[PDB]
Scaffold this active site. Structure first.
Site, PDB file in Angstrom:
ATOM      1  CD1 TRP A  98      16.512 -31.404 -57.064  1.00 34.48           C
ATOM      2  CD2 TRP A  98      15.275 -32.523 -58.561  1.00 34.48           C
ATOM      3  NE1 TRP A  98      16.571 -30.719 -58.252  1.00 34.48           N
ATOM      4  CE2 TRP A  98      15.823 -31.389 -59.188  1.00 34.48           C
ATOM      5  CE3 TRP A  98      14.467 -33.383 -59.309  1.00 34.48           C
ATOM      6  CZ2 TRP A  98      15.576 -31.088 -60.530  1.00 34.48           C
ATOM      7  CZ3 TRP A  98      14.232 -33.087 -60.635  1.00 34.48           C
ATOM      8  CH2 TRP A  98      14.781 -31.952 -61.231  1.00 34.48           C
ATOM      9  CG  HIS A 100      14.358 -38.071 -64.180  1.00 35.54           C
ATOM     10  ND1 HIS A 100      14.715 -37.181 -63.191  1.00 35.54           N
ATOM     11  CD2 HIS A 100      14.901 -37.598 -65.327  1.00 35.54           C
ATOM     12  CE1 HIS A 100      15.460 -36.221 -63.710  1.00 35.54           C
ATOM     13  NE2 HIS A 100      15.593 -36.455 -65.003  1.00 35.54           N
ATOM     14  CD  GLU A 111      16.418 -35.585 -70.159  1.00 39.51           C
ATOM     15  OE1 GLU A 111      15.521 -35.242 -70.959  1.00 39.51           O
ATOM     16  OE2 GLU A 111      16.229 -35.626 -68.924  1.00 39.51           O
TER      17      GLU A 111
HETATM   18  C1  LIG Z   1      11.079 -27.843 -63.084  1.00 42.88           C
HETATM   19  N1  LIG Z   1      11.832 -28.215 -61.876  1.00 42.88           N
HETATM   20  C2  LIG Z   1      10.869 -28.841 -60.959  1.00 42.88           C
HETATM   21  C3  LIG Z   1      12.776 -29.255 -62.294  1.00 42.88           C
HETATM   22  C4  LIG Z   1      13.888 -28.633 -63.100  1.00 42.88           C
HETATM   23  O1  LIG Z   1      14.157 -27.452 -62.949  1.00 42.88           O
HETATM   24  N2  LIG Z   1      14.546 -29.420 -63.970  1.00 42.88           N
HETATM   25  C5  LIG Z   1      15.621 -29.057 -64.800  1.00 42.88           C
HETATM   26  C6  LIG Z   1      16.523 -28.029 -64.497  1.00 42.88           C
HETATM   27  C7  LIG Z   1      17.565 -27.752 -65.358  1.00 42.88           C
HETATM   28  C8  LIG Z   1      17.729 -28.504 -66.525  1.00 42.88           C
HETATM   29  N3  LIG Z   1      18.790 -28.207 -67.364  1.00 42.88           N
HETATM   30  C9  LIG Z   1      19.030 -28.871 -68.508  1.00 42.88           C
HETATM   31  O2  LIG Z   1      19.982 -28.546 -69.212  1.00 42.88           O
HETATM   32  C10 LIG Z   1      18.131 -29.969 -68.902  1.00 42.88           C
HETATM   33  C11 LIG Z   1      18.357 -30.678 -70.082  1.00 42.88           C
HETATM   34  C12 LIG Z   1      17.510 -31.705 -70.450  1.00 42.88           C
HETATM   35  C13 LIG Z   1      16.437 -32.033 -69.643  1.00 42.88           C
HETATM   36  C14 LIG Z   1      16.194 -31.357 -68.467  1.00 42.88           C
HETATM   37  C15 LIG Z   1      17.041 -30.313 -68.076  1.00 42.88           C
HETATM   38  C16 LIG Z   1      16.834 -29.545 -66.832  1.00 42.88           C
HETATM   39  C17 LIG Z   1      15.785 -29.803 -65.953  1.00 42.88           C
END
Ligand SMILES: CN(C)CC(=O)Nc1ccc2[nH]c(=O)c3ccccc3c2c1
Length: 179
Positions: free
Chosen positions: A25, A34, A128
């Site tokens: 982003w 983060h 992660e």
């Molecule tokens: C909530 N949005 C402002 C940010 C967002 O959509 N983040 C997002 C969006 C998709 C994400 N997909 C994942 O598989 C994942 C796995 C471990 C930790 C985070 C994620 C993940 C995070």
């Protein structure tokens, strides 16, 4: 032994992801921001990391939360109830950094008197992996498409491979991310 494969749930479809990959982003490569969410907030969405998990199951948990959100939104009149989510399988390389390891390295340098991640979340973060700046489409192997009709409860799962995927013998970086 760093993973050779990680997974990412995304709402974006393969016509986007298989051509463009995943892109971060912004240019904020502060690991603590983060992980805590400061660099993911509205008005503050500037993280330089794309999150993935070495656990496919954990990405399914993420997808299923978003699915339930869509079901509840339709019940409240704020959505169609037709949910589509995608689980992407990704080849990890040296541009992918362990979240927990990167956190411990951040703390060793700046301390934790202020920003401190709770034990439960940190345990999840052992799985992660943070890709810096982008995940090229050449790293993305395939997708599972999950459709759910919120009103009827009916679901389908469909698989497609990425023609642009490039096979290489890589795995995630063994070291923490450092800025
Ligand atoms: C909530 N949005 C402002 C940010 C967002 O959509 N983040 C997002 C969006 C998709 C994400 N997909 C994942 O598989 C994942 C796995 C471990 C930790 C985070 C994620 C993940 C995070």
């Amino acid at each position: 032994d760093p993973p050779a494969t990680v997974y990412r749930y995304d709402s974006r479809p393969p016509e986007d992801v298989f051509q463009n990959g995943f892109t971060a982003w912004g240019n904020n490569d502060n690991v603590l921001e983060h992980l805590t969410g400061r660099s993911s907030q509205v008005g503050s969405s500037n993280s330089a990391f794309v999150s993935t998990s070495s656990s496919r199951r954990y990405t399914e948990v993420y997808l299923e939360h978003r699915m339930q959100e869509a079901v509840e939104a339709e019940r409240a009149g704020r959505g169609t109830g037709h949910f589509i989510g995608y689980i992407y399988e990704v080849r990890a390389d040296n541009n992918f950094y362990g979240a927990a390891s990167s956190y411990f390295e951040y703390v060793d340098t700046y301390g934790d008197n202020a920003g401190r991640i709770l034990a439960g979340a940190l345990a999840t973060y052992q799985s992660e992996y943070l890709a810096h700046r982008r995940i090229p489409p050449e790293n993305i192997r395939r997708v599972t498409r999950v459709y759910h009709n919120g009103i009827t409860g009916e679901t389908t799962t469909t698989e497609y491979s990425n023609a642009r995927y490039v096979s290489q013998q890589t795995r995630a970086n063994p070291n923490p991310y450092t800025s």
